[PDB]
Symmetry: C6
Subunit: 26 residues, 6 copies
């Protein structure tokens, strides 16, 4: 339900921040 939805969007956020982190480093 909505809890699975919330976990899925949090995973999305984590992966966007990893992209921001690697680029920032670069």
């Amino acid at each position: 339900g909505e809890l699975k939805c919330i976990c899925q969007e949090l995973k999305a956020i984590a992966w966007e921040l990893k992209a921001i982190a690697k680029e920032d480093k670069a």
Copy 2:
């Protein structure tokens, strides 16, 4: 209900971070 509001806002946040992650590149 409120759990749906929460999921929808996390989707918005994920999308804005995608924009920030892309911007820094382009």
Copy 3:
């Protein structure tokens, strides 16, 4: 109650992120 509180602060966060993404 408390769930509505959480919803409203996530709206506030999405809104600050929108300001950040625009000015960048």
Copy 4:
């Protein structure tokens, strides 16, 4: 309660992002 705790940390998050948005 843990829910109040969660809403309070989200406000603290929105606060810092407002500082990042205003600065940038």
Copy 5:
């Protein structure tokens, strides 16, 4: 329990953002 887990991680997120905001004066 897991709700205490979630509050603690949000505290950790708010702390890293406070660090980013403080160094952001550049």
Copy 6:
């Protein structure tokens, strides 16, 4: 279950923000 999934993703987000905060420190 679902709440543990949420906590785990928040840990992942906190870790990426830590990386960002430390890069920025430089």
